């Protein structure tokens, strides 16, 4: 059994738990979700490096005052304290948190825990970063 199907098996079980009919990876090995119609999360399977990537949209750059990218970089210096680091998508204008799961520890329990944590922080920086008040 290849890695792709191993993960597809995990996403099928995860779907059954939350109430979605089905859930699988793309031909590119991708799958996206939308939480509370606000936080978008994308799953990225890297079969080569055997690891699952998790992208999370935090906030839009239009609501952010400048000088924040510096405070985000200062965060990445201690990313190991949360296993999460910041990134940016120029095309979308969205600030993103990234989390990864090694194929060796990739289980349902670990996947849900890593996702819930990623969302916990994403929602936090989504409510904190904006300066528009």
């Amino acid at each position: 059994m290849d890695l792709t199907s191993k993960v597809n098996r995990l996403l099928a079980e995860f779907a059954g738990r939350i109430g979605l009919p089905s859930l699988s990876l793309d031909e590119e090995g991708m799958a996206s979700l939308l939480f509370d119609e606000q936080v978008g999360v994308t799953l990225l399977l890297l079969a080569e490096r055997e690891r699952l990537l998790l992208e999370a949209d935090v906030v839009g750059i239009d609501v952010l005052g400048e000088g924040i990218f510096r405070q985000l970089a200062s965060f990445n210096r201690h990313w190991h304290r949360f296993d999460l680091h910041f990134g940016f998508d120029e095309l979308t204008g969205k600030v993103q948190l990234y989390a990864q799961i090694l194929a060796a520890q990739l289980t349902l329990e670990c996947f849900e825990a890593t996702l819930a944590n990623l969302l916990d922080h994403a929602e936090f920086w989504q409510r904190l970063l904006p300066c528009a008040s």
């Binding site: 939350i18 109430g19 979605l20 799958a31 996206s32 939308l34 939480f35 095309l91 819930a116 969302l119």
Partner: protein
């Protein structure tokens, strides 16, 4: 009707991947020089 799920106190819907919407030569260590400081 659009399917809606629930995860840790959050609603969840299937989202599009929108892949089209939004987006080295290894050098051995034996050759590299070292300087403990």
């Amino acid at each position: 009707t659009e399917a809606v799920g629930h995860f840790e106190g959050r609603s969840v819907t299937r989202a599009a991947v929108r892949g089209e919407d939004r987006s080295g030569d290894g050098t051995p260590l034996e050759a590299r020089t070292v300087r403990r400081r």
